[PDB]
Swiss-Prot record, chains A, B:
Name of the protein: Transcriptional activator CadC
Function: Regulates the lysine- and pH-dependent expression of the lysine decarboxylase CadA and the cadaverine-lysine antiporter CadB. At low external pH, and in the presence of external lysine, CadC activates transcription of the cadBA operon by binding directly to two sites, Cad1 and Cad2, within the cadBA promoter region (Pcad). Preferentially binds to AT-rich regions within the Cad1 promoter.
Manganese among keywords: no
Resulting phenotype, residue 53 to R: Confers pH-independent cadBA expression
Lineage: Bacteria, Pseudomonadati, Pseudomonadota, Gammaproteobacteria, Enterobacterales
Main location: membrane
Interval of the full protein contained in this chain: 190 to 511 of 512
Amino acid sequence: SRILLNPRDIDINMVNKSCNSWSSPYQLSYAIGVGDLVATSLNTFSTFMVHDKINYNIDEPSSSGKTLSIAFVNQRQYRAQQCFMSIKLVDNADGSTMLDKRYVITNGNQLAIQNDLLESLSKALNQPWPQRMQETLQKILPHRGALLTNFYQAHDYLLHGDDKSLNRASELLGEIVQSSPEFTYARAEKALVDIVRHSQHPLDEKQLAALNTEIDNIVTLPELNNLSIIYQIKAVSALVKGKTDESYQAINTGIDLEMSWLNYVLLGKVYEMKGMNREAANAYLTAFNLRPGANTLYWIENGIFQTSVPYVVPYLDKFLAS
Amino acid sequence: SRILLNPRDIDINMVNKSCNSWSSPYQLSYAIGVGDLVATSLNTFSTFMVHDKINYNIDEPSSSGKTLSIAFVNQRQYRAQQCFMSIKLVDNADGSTMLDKRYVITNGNQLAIQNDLLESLSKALNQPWPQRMQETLQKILPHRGALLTNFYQAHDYLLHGDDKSLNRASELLGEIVQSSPEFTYARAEKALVDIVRHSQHPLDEKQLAALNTEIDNIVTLPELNNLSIIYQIKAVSALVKGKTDESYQAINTGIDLEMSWLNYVLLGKVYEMKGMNREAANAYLTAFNLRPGANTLYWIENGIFQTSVPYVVPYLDKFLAS
């Protein structure tokens, strides 16, 4: 009844949520963004498997050989002291600490910390980052620290997935794009947020129209060539139009480019449209393994169109009840 | 205390070992070779993770979402009837049978069955095989059915790893190479078997010499460009010479080309030579996850040079005792 630890399976955990008192955004959403970026980079570009558990409150038995912890700590030298972001990588087999970082976040060093994190993991894991990974990040990242904070706040609304969160994501990203129009990826994230909003409330129109200009623009920017996010947009657009084969093709390319909780949800969605519930539930369960918790659960149940977990994903319905 | 099934983790199981009575080789080693080929192809060329448990007698709790079973079955129409190789892929989450094949092996259809298996898995898993995978297989496979049977018998001796097994592997592969000199990969497998033998008994010489001609030849055959097996040979050769950096470099390229139990053992071996036991034990435990059982255990403890599992791999020593 021993469970064998798998040294190439990694959990990512978060603790001390809210240095002091309620949230408290800013630092939390930055850390959530970073952890999602580590997870997706590793799932996509290495033979490591990562469960991003940042949004998961539950301690369950895992065969994960390694655990990456993110914790906001204070030394305790005074009242309302400044936090540091403690990040540790532990080997659960041999007990050792593989990496132990203490980051002070400053309003300019957000990109630098994240880069340091990814270099450090590369070394601790003997995992070189591939050219495609390095070229994808130069395409998706802003250059100024504070734009990354802002981006990750909008991104965290996206993760949440509810109407109000998405409306907030959209408006934040419109701001970001206004202050830095070169930041193409922000436009792409805004376009994804906007198609998703519309997908769920398909009888609405702003000055019309609108969303179509945005989406028409975005799929033509040569800069966004060969990014998953453009395939996510194409998938959603084709599903809304009931062009299921085109949606299928699009999301499968997206998955080739990025192994993410969201791509597997979108694939589940397309499978339901194909009348293939068992393939759908399998995709949703893959999504849940990648990022377990209320955000992903929320997206399975609500994203694009509504989905009954009890009827369509019985394995997950039963798992969550147990 | 629920364990979440991971739909991209696959166990491969074997049953009915020995259609009838003792072994019984031929069909068994063919099936072992096929299962090792499925495992390594999937680990290497997809985001699936496979535990090849064909050589593992133990039932332990696994979060594997899917299980591939290989079983030798008889209908029971007469005495000493002919076996069929039953191969099923089951989804442990939703209970369903994803693939159910009944193969009759004939002395000519060995390549054809294996190909059919790999096409079928590709479809059942929605997993297209990449160009590098398809080009690697055309390079490593013979064309005549019976050569594959012979190859996999020698390969199975390799898996076993003991002196007598390797001597048998070597002689079988010398035969194979004599009857089909175009079958370059057989020469490579023979060269790998031969360096490994020599590594373990470094004070022996045949007509001298010998092994060096074989190894000198093999690393020059342009046909074997960009195959893991050449990097395995270079790794072993450099370790024997105490050229640790060169061995390190070689095995890490090998691992880029093929994610296999053996590459991770070889890497563990190089780590010990680097004075890095914790990195070694981590590599060995990766090897054990890839192919758990006595063969891999045997290679950890004996391959190239001797290694104490109790002192060098305490996590595994303790796991196996529990």
